[PDB]
């Protein structure tokens, strides 16, 4: 039995204390591709979000280590990834999980488990939207066309329901220029080392 | 042996062997120079698309016997990772990156010529069923 008003206020004056954070240092900057670098790619597979499946792209240009001094993700590497859901109305791009990079000269493989982007780094591969309007409307249209020819709302409300049951689908051409946002540090320490010359 | 695996591997890493064909032509559009190849040729088995050493790698598609543009298999070769060696040979090709495209036509497509019956890319290494 202390005042409720009083307690609520006391509670709102009690913040969640955030923990301070300690800086440290990256262990192998010459042998690491760190979070936030971009891997520019050109898609091998065409893409169509009607049925969930897989995608490939091939690294377009070399990507260097955290300090920019060592080549680590080689141009011409193959990347395999998956597109496992589709798009909704109001969307013109889709989430893409790029899984593994495989250098085909060398055999170096790394699970990057990173998201695909644009060339400018925003999330998802952009594409062309097919709204499937005709298929989403034809039933109601056909039916009502009788109702009309039956003459000289609830249907309409059922129509909209049916209209929403089929999604738009996204297409993107083969060979598109596209990118990957590196989501996690990629450590090449166990694979490459350095020597003169 | 480990030393045997190494010799066979090096030997094999050498065949794009055989009579070569250089008879290739391409569309020429100025907007598309940024993905044009410097060379295209073949072996009658595999086809090489060579780009400038530091150029971005575009992607390559083939026109199949079926009439359709088709995604083939390929690997890069070269110190500069600038040559796409496609694991196949074809009458016609597309080079693509974003909305740039370059048509490439093989004026001496001769399926029928140049097979090797070895089970590898090379005339000198053979695939053996254990």
């Amino acid at each position: 039995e202390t005042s409720e008003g009083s307690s609520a206020l006391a509670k709102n004056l009690t913040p969640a204390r955030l923990k301070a954070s300690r800086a440290g240092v990256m262990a192998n900057p010459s042998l690491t591709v760190p979070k936030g670098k971009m891997i520019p790619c050109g898609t091998g597979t065409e893409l169509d979000t009607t049925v969930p499946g897989q995608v490939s792209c091939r690294v377009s240009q070399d990507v260097y280590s955290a300090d920019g001094l060592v080549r680590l993700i080689d141009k011409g590497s193959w990347v395999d990834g998956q597109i496992t859901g589709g798009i909704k109305d109001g969307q013109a791009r889709v989430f893409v999980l790029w899984e593994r990079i495989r250098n085909d000269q060398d055999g170096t493989i790394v699970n990057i488990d990173s998201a695909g982007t644009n060339s400018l780094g925003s999330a998802g591969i952009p594409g062309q939207v097919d709204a499937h309007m005709w298929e989403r409307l034809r039933g109601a249209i056909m039916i009502s066309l009788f109702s009309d020819t039956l003459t000289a709302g609830q249907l309409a409300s059922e129509a909209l329901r049916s209209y929403m049951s089929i999604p738009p689908t996204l297409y993107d051409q083969q060979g598109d220029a596209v990118s990957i946002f590196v989501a996690r540090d990629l450590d090449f320490s166990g694979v490459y080392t350095l020597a003169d010359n | 042996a480990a030393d045997k695996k190494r010799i066979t591997q090096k030997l094999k890493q050498t065949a794009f062997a055989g009579a070569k064909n250089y008879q290739y032509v391409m569309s020429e559009q100025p907007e598309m120079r940024s993905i044009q190849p410097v060379h295209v040729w073949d072996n009658y088995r595999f086809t090489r698309f060579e780009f400038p050493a530091n150029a971005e790698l575009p992607q390559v598609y083939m026109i199949s016997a079926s009439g359709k543009e088709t995604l083939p298999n390929s690997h890069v070769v070269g110190e500069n990772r600038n040559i796409i060696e496609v694991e196949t040979v074809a009458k016609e090709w597309r080079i693509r990156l974003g909305d740039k495209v370059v048509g490439v036509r093989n004026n001496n497509f001769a399926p029928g010529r140049g097979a090797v019956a070895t089970g590898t890319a090379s005339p000198d290494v053979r695939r053996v069923q254990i």
Binding site: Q128, V129, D130, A131, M133, W134, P168, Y171, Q173, Q174, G175 | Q13, T14, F16, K20, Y22, Y24, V25, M26, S27, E28, Q29, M32, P37, H39, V40, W41, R48, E50, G78, R94, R96, D99, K100, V101, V102, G103, V104, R105
Partner: peptide
């Protein structure tokens, strides 16, 4: 938003040899 427009097709008005010089296989 019906369908999907396919990627561009080359313009062949001006067609040209690829090889200005003969390539070499460096193995």
């Amino acid at each position: 938003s019906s369908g999907h427009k396919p990627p561009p097709e080359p313009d062949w008005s001006n067609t040209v040899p690829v090889n200005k010089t003969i390539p070499v296989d460096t193995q």
